[PDB]
Amino acid sequence: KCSLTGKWTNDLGSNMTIGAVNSRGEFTGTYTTAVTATSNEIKESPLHGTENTINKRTQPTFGFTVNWKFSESTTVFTGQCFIDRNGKEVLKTMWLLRSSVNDIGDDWKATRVGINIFTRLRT
Amino acid sequence: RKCSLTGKWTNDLGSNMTIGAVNSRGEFTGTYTTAVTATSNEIKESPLHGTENTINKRTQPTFGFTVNWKFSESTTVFTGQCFIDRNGKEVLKTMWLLRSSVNDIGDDWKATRVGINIFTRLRT
Amino acid sequence: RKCSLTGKWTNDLGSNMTIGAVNSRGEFTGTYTTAVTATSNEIKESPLHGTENTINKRTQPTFGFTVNWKFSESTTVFTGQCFIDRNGKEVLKTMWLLRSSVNDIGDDWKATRVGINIFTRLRT
Amino acid sequence: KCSLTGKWTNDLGSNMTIGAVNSRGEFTGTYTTAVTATSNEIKESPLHGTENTINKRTQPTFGFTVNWKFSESTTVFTGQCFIDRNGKEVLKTMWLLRSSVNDIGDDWKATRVGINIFTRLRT
Numbered sequence A, D: 001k002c003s004l005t006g007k008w009t010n011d012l013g014s015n016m017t018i019g020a021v022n023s024r025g026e027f028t029g030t031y032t033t034a035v036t037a038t039s040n041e042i043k044e045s046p047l048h049g050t051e052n053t054i055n056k057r058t059q060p061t062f063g064f065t066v067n068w069k070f071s072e073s074t075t076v077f078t079g080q081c082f083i084d085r086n087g088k089e090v091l092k093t094m095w096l097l098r099s100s101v102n103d104i105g106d107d108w109k110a111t112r113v114g115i116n117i118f119t120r121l122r123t
Numbered sequence B, C: 001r002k003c004s005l006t007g008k009w010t011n012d013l014g015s016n017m018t019i020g021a022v023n024s025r026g027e028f029t030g031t032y033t034t035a036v037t038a039t040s041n042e043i044k045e046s047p048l049h050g051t052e053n054t055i056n057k058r059t060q061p062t063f064g065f066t067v068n069w070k071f072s073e074s075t076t077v078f079t080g081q082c083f084i085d086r087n088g089k090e091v092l093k094t095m096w097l098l099r100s101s102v103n104d105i106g107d108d109w110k111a112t113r114v115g116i117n118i119f120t121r122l123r124t
C-alpha cells in the first residue's frame, strides 16, 4: 500500500521526489535539502535507491543514496514506509552522512547520524 | 591517484562485493554476498546500487550504496570513502545501517542496527 | 537561562526518567522507567548515572548517561543536549545506542541498535 | 572473567583507566583521548559508567560516559567485554559524540558515530 513514488517532505523541511519503482525494487529521484552541514549553496541532488519486494508487504523497507551536488558529501537513508491509523503514509527513516576527509587517520569522525520523517505533500 | 569503486572486494566479516561501472554520474550497481545474517534464511546473492561523489575531483571520493537483500524483508545502506592507503592499496572505510522489517510502527524504534566495515580488494 | 537535568521527564515512547543532583562535576544519577523493550522480561525501574558538561558555562550543556537495565543482560547509553526552547520550555534532544548481549564475539556486528528520543518535563 | 577494572588502549591510541566496579555495576575512570574533533588542547577527562551484573556473565555489557575536560562536548560508549581465543580481553565498543550547538534547529547534526576497540596495556 505504502508507495514510495511521489513527493515527500521532512521534519527539517527537505523535499524529495521519487519516480516509480520497478520490478527490481529500484527507483530514482531528487532531493532538495533545506539544511546543510557544508557551507555551500544548496542545490537539488539526485537520489538512487531501491525498495524491498520480498513479499508484497504493504509496508516495505527502503533505502536510497543521495549524491549531493553541492558537497563532496554523501548521504544514505534507510527506513520503512508505514500506513498510519489516519490512513496516511509515513516514511520513518534514519540516515548516515559521510563527510569527505583527507586522511584515513581522520575517518573516525567522518560520520554523523540521525533521523527524518517523511510525509506527503498536497496537490 | 585513483580509488575506483569498480572491482571485487571482500570485507572484515567475510562478506564479498562486486561493483561495476561508475557513470559520468557516480551511479553504479553490483552484487553482494553477505557472509552473515541477522535473519534465518539461506543467503542469496543480492543486488546493489549506489552513487560515487564527484563534486571536486577527489582521488578518494565518498560513496554510498543500498543492498536489497534477496532473502529477506529488510535492507542495509552502506556509506564510506575510498581511501588510497600508504601501501598504495585502496581501502574502503565504511559504515552502515541495517533496517529490519517491523509489523507495527510503534515498534519502529527498534528496527535500526548500526555498524562498521572495511573493504579490501580481492583482485590479485 | 537554565536547563537543568534535574527533574522528572517523560519521553516520546512513553518512557520516564527521574534525575537528581548534578555535582560541581556534572555527575548525576537517577532512575529509569522504560515503557518498551527489545527483550521479553517484565520491566523494572533501572538505575542511571551520567555526567553534564560544564566546560564554558552554557545554558544548554550537553550530557550523556548510561542505563543499567535491571531486567536484562544489555545496556543503553543516551547523549544529548538540554535545549531551552522558545516557549521557554526545556527540551532534552537525545540519542542512544542499545547494546544487546551476544554469546560470541563473531556475532558482535549485530548487537548495536541506534535511535532517538526527546525528553520533556513531567513536572507541573 | 572479562574485567573492566584496569588500563586499556584503543585502535586510535586513546588511554583509559577504570577503577573497580561495585555491586551496583558502577565504575569510574579517566580518558586520555589521542584525537579530538575540537580544536583544543586535549586533556585527561573523567568517565563514569556502569557494568552489567545481570547474571554472572563472563562477558558483560558496559557503557560509560566521558565528560570531556577540554570541550563543551560529551561522549558515550557502550559495548561488551569479550574473552578471546587467545585468552585475551576485548572491549568491542561503539560510541556517540555530541557536539554542543546554539540552536535546537541545528541539533540534527550535533551527532557523530563510530567504534573503538580496547585492549589492555602491559606492565
Ligand SMILES: O=C(O)CCCC[C@@H]1SC[C@@H]2NC(=O)N[C@@H]21
Residues within 6 Å of the ligand: A010, A012, A014, A033, A034, A035, A036, A037, A038, A068, A071, A072, A073, A074, A075, A095, A097, A116
Ligand atoms: O553537508 C553536506 O555535505 C550536505 C548535507 C545534506 C543535508 C543532510 S542529509 C541528512 C539531513 N537530512 C536532510 O534533509 N538534510 C540533512
Ligand SMILES: O=C(O)CCCC[C@@H]1SC[C@@H]2NC(=O)N[C@@H]21
Residues within 6 Å of the ligand: B011, B013, B015, B034, B035, B036, B037, B038, B039, B069, B072, B074, B075, B076, B096, B098, B115, B117, C109
Ligand atoms: O539479516 C538480514 O536481514 C540480511 C542482512 C545481510 C548482511 C548484513 S549488511 C550489514 C552487515 N555486514 C555484512 O557484510 N552483512 C551484514
Ligand SMILES: O=C(O)CCCC[C@@H]1SC[C@@H]2NC(=O)N[C@@H]21
Residues within 6 Å of the ligand: B109, C011, C013, C015, C034, C035, C036, C037, C038, C039, C069, C072, C074, C075, C076, C096, C098, C115, C117
Ligand atoms: O530491551 C532491553 O534490552 C532493555 C531496553 C529498555 C529500553 C530501551 S533504551 C532505548 C529505547 N528508549 C527507551 O525509552 N527505551 C528503549
Ligand SMILES: O=C(O)CCCC[C@@H]1SC[C@@H]2NC(=O)N[C@@H]21
Residues within 6 Å of the ligand: D010, D012, D014, D033, D034, D035, D036, D037, D038, D068, D071, D072, D073, D074, D075, D095, D097, D116
Ligand atoms: O571533539 C571533542 O569535543 C572531544 C573529542 C574526544 C575524542 C573522541 S571520543 C570518540 C572517539 N574515540 C576516541 O578515543 N576519541 C574520539
Ligand SMILES: *[C@@H]1O[C@H](CO)[C@@H](O)[C@H](O)[C@H]1NC(C)=O
Residues within 6 Å of the ligand: A013, A014, A015, A032, A033, A034, A121
Ligand atoms: C519544499 O517545497 C514546499 C512547497 O512545495 C516549500 O514550502 C518548502 O519550503 C520546500 N523546502 C525545500 C525547497 O526543501
Ligand SMILES: *[C@@H]1O[C@H](CO)[C@@H](O)[C@H](O)[C@H]1NC(C)=O
Residues within 6 Å of the ligand: D013, D014, D015, D032, D033, D034, D121
Ligand atoms: C597511552 O600511553 C602509551 C604508553 O603508556 C603511549 O604510547 C600512548 O601514546 C598513549 N596515548 C594516549 C596518551 O592517549
